[PDB]
Design a protein around this ligand. Structure first.
Ligand SMILES: NC(=O)c1ccc[n+]([C@@H]2O[C@H](COP(=O)([O-])OP(=O)(O)OC[C@H]3O[C@@H](n4cnc5c(N)ncnc54)[C@H](OP(=O)(O)O)[C@@H]3O)[C@@H](O)[C@H]2O)c1
Ligand SMILES: CC1(C)[C@@H](O)CC[C@]2(C)[C@H]3C(=O)C=C4[C@@H]5C[C@@](C)(C(=O)O)CC[C@]5(C)CC[C@@]4(C)[C@]3(C)CC[C@@H]12
Ligand SMILES: CC1(C)[C@@H](O)CC[C@]2(C)[C@H]3C(=O)C=C4[C@@H]5C[C@@](C)(C(=O)O)CC[C@]5(C)CC[C@@]4(C)[C@]3(C)CC[C@@H]12
Length: 349
């Protein structure tokens, strides 16, 4: 047996705690030399870290959609790899495959049925895009806008995006323009990200919530109010945005990342004053869970791919190398170190 590396849950930060690199631990383990019928041996190429993983660090995730990781057991999440050996009828050495529950380990023996083969032509050979813009975050943005945004044919709406330089947000803002908004404004956490948005991703304006006057800048950059809010963050930021939203406007309630490490359920309740405004102005604020639109994954991926290949959709990512950096990458992402999709490259081939 050859020795490979893997990552296990070392400790929990507590439901009110901050995640740190050291909640995870690297181990060296043997990889079995033989696989069974129906199984494949895969080499891991890229792994995703994503905010929802914070929940799997707790004893109770707070939702049936994801289960808690267990102390000292291998952790898992979105991944992409290449088949090294197959005893599954529909997979063959050299196929590129993805799983939602890829164990954080350099080489893995997996049930062939748990994997999906992917076509690298969809991403011009940039396989890591399958974990981001031409993956679940991209679908979340495209489907969320389609289903919850109500961007009418021929209209000239203003869209605001929170978490605007992250995975979902950076795509959402571009899609807002693609699909007919005349104004797209992003809110994000650094001046570097503001520049990215307006100089590369085509946002009409960007606001740094840590340093700028958010209400003031939204009044300046959204002179006709806000019709569509793609909300990744919640909290104080969303209160400020909602206060400037128009009658019959729409909140795409993607995530509420500002309410993490507090024991706060989703959808989190708007404060009394902000709920009053929401209701007065008939602002819609429904649950949105991308998995409820599985039937749109095919056209969604096909559209994301097309826009990318056309040079319209600009795909940003921040890649860190080495499985030993999974914990660091997750912590970094949670605290805003990522521009676009946070990726960890496990083998650079
Ligand atoms: N509804 C769905 O089906 C669905 C699907 C996928 C993801 N999501 C959710 O959508 C959200 C975005 O996920 P993502 O994958 O696109 O992550 P991401 O935006 O790429 O990364 C998270 C970012 O959140 C920002 N942030 C962190 N703490 C914050 C705070 N307290 N206040 C404001 N901003 C903060 C940081 O950027 P700054 O530098 O700008 O602070 C960080 O880079 C998360 O809530 C995620 O769980 C929902
Ligand atoms: C996991 C995510 C979100 C992504 O991270 C990687 C790509 C992918 C795994 C993706 C894929 O790779 C191939 C197909 C196929 C494309 C197509 C056109 C075909 O090739 O027949 C039609 C059938 C089929 C199954 C539709 C569904 C998708 C788009 C499928 C599985 C949706 C889920 C998707
Ligand atoms: C496909 C699976 C099963 C998983 O394989 C990948 C992540 C994910 C796509 C996952 C996600 O990515 C982000 C969230 C959010 C996390 C959280 C805490 C927030 O961020 O506000 C609360 C709101 C919200 C939408 C709850 C639902 C989940 C857990 C959501 C969509 C459930 C479905 C889930």
């Amino acid at each position: 047996m050859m020795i490979v590396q893997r990552v296990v849950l070392n400790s929990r930060p507590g439901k009110n705690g901050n995640p740190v690199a050291e909640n995870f631990r690297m181990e060296e383990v043997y990889l079995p030399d033989n696989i069974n019928e129906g199984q494949v041996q895969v080499r891991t190429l890229y792994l995703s870290v994503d905010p929802y993983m914070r929940c799997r660090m707790n004893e109770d995730t707070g939702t049936d959609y994801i289960t808690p990781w267990q102390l000292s057991q291998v952790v898992d999440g979105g991944g992409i790899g290449i088949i090294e050996e197959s005893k599954h009828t529909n997979l063959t050495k050299g196929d590129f495959v993805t799983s939602f529950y890829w164990p954080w380990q350099t080489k893995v023996i997996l049930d062939g049925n748990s994997l999906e083969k992917v076509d690298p032509q969809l991403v011009d050979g940039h396989l890591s895009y399958f974990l981001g813009a031409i993956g679940m975050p991209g679908l979340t943005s495209l489907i969320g806008i389609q289903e919850k945004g109500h961007i009418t044919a021929g209209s000239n709406k203003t869209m605001v995006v929170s978490g605007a330089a992250g995975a979902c947000g950076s795509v959402a803002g571009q899609i807002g323009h693609f699909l007919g908004c005349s104004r797209v404004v992003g809110i994000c956490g650094t001046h570097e990200k503001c520049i990215l948005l307006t100089s590369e991703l085509g946002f009409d304006a960007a606001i740094n919530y840590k340093k700028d006057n958010v209400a003031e800048q939204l009044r300046e950059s959204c002179p006709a109010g806000v019709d569509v809010y793609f909300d990744n963050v919640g909290g104080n930021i969303s209160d400020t945005v909602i206060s400037q939203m128009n009658e019959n406007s729409h909140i795409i309630l993607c995530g509420q990342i500002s309410q993490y490490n507090k024991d706060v359920p989703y959808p989190p309740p708007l404060s009394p004053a902000i709920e009053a405004i929401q209701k007065e102005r008939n602002i819609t604020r429904e649950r949105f869970l991308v998995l409820n639109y599985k039937d749109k994954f095919e056209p969604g991926i096909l559209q994301l791919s097309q826009w990318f290949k056309e040079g319209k959709l600009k795909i940003k990512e921040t890649v860190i190398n080495g499985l030993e950096n999974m914990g660091a990458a997750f912590q970094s992402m949670m605290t805003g170190g990522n521009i676009g999709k946070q990726i960890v490259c496990i083998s650079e081939e």
